[model samples]
Target: ACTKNAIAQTGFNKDKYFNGDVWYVTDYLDLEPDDVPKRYCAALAAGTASGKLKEALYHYDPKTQDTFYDVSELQVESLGKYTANFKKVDKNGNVKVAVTAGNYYTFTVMYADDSSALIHVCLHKGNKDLGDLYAVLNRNKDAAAGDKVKSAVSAATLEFSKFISTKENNCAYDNDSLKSLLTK
Candidate 1:
């Protein structure tokens, strides 16, 4: 329901994220949510809704009106709270969107422009078969999990582009069976 001409380039012209849920790595890293631009953070909702219906993945940063992150830092910013939750993850790094019944899996990374940005790198799955592998990745947090997302989402995007790759729409159903819509 937002503007159509705004995110024409990044795909927010549709509102895919409206039906999805998102998690941020920086939230766990202790970065103040306020530090993130309100528009960029809010755009997370419009990401998945891109008009293109062939790919299920996207990555945006704080560049234009469509980026997912700002030009922050690569490292995690400390919010000075209990660092226990922010323990340096083993780097095995596995993240995914478990689709009890689908074949597409998507990943989006919202990075910043600072030394400790690049906070929100999330994975979404529409294909259970493809997402199942990602589920395993979340469990094996130290097994080069980053690369896994690179592969899974890359595969999903291919299928999503069958439609208007020109930025009209993105497909949501390709390999899943269960369907539940959430409202925020």
Candidate 2:
């Protein structure tokens, strides 16, 4: 179950965070390990379109070569916290699965700066709550987690050593697709 109630970043700059740029997950800690693959790569693009906040997500598994995309419309819960309803979509924004009740995720920006960020997510699908997932993000896909984000991890009382690094997974992303999907 998703039990952790993560705190939002203090004085988070919403305008800068949703600046229409891609943030890559360099490392992550999943509380429920059995629910997901051992090695994962993911990235997201956040921005506002037509006065509504939106996000595009990309998930990849290096071992299995599996990939998927999602587009979400975000509703703010508070500063730096949002509830998102997602739809499975193709790279070109063709919806494969439309949004339905109980299919959503709660996102919280725990920390962020110009080039790096730390976030917590809780995914809910149907009757299941997938548990807490904390990610260290960076503007550059291959960039190492900076001191700022690492400190945020420590602040969250999570050990950095336990996090899995996506850098060693030989991951690749479709940047253009993710960028354009922000407005979809």
Candidate 3:
């Protein structure tokens, strides 16, 4: 149940990571099965809004065509570790579900470069701990995982082959909505 305390990247660069750009989840490994769809797509936008760190999330299921959006305010735990309180929102930033005390996620940047990253997330809702999730992200949605991020996956003791690829899922995103959601 969200057991891993993933190590952050050595000399992690927060400025580059939260550079107001979108990162696509090209691959993912979920420790807990049945927590989400077997095949899915997700992306996120990270930036600072009004001097506070914020993030916008987008999740999609290629088969079901299900989509959802979330906006979160991040509270730093360390250089690359943060606890985020998220509220489900529409693409236009209208609240669909308000944030609750137990609704949050812990995020850690295991590795990152200018164009790619490896991250770990532990999501919590009410009394349920959704377990560990590791993702390989890229600035270009169609880009393959570079050697640096692949090595980071290996360093984390995870097999890159075990991760599911979102690239083959026929996913598309609304970039403008995610960017604008930063202030909302």
TM-scores for every candidate against the unseen true structure: 0.16, 0.98, 0.98
Report clashes for each candidate as comma-separated counts: 58, 0, 0
Model 1: lDDT equals 0.21
What are the per-residue Cα lDDT tens digits for candidate 3 across 1-184?
8879999999999999998899999999889966777899999999998999999999999998889999999999999999999999999999999988999999999999999999999999988987899999999999998899999999999989889898888898999999999989
lDDT of 2 by residue, 69-151 (tens): 99999999999999999999999999999999999999999999999999999999999987899999999999988799999
lDDT of every model, 2 decimals: 0.21, 0.93, 0.93
The sequence of per-residue lDDT tens digits that candidate 1 reaches over residues 17-67 is: 223333222112112323223221111111222332111222233345342
In model 3, how large is the Cα lDDT of residue 154? Answer: 96
- Candidate 3: regions farther than 4 A off: none
Supply candidate 2's per-residue lDDT for 175: 88
Misplaced by over 4 Å in model 1 are 1-9, 20-27, 32-184
Residue 24 displacement in candidate 1 (angstroms): 8.7
Sequence-dependent TM-score of model 2: 0.98
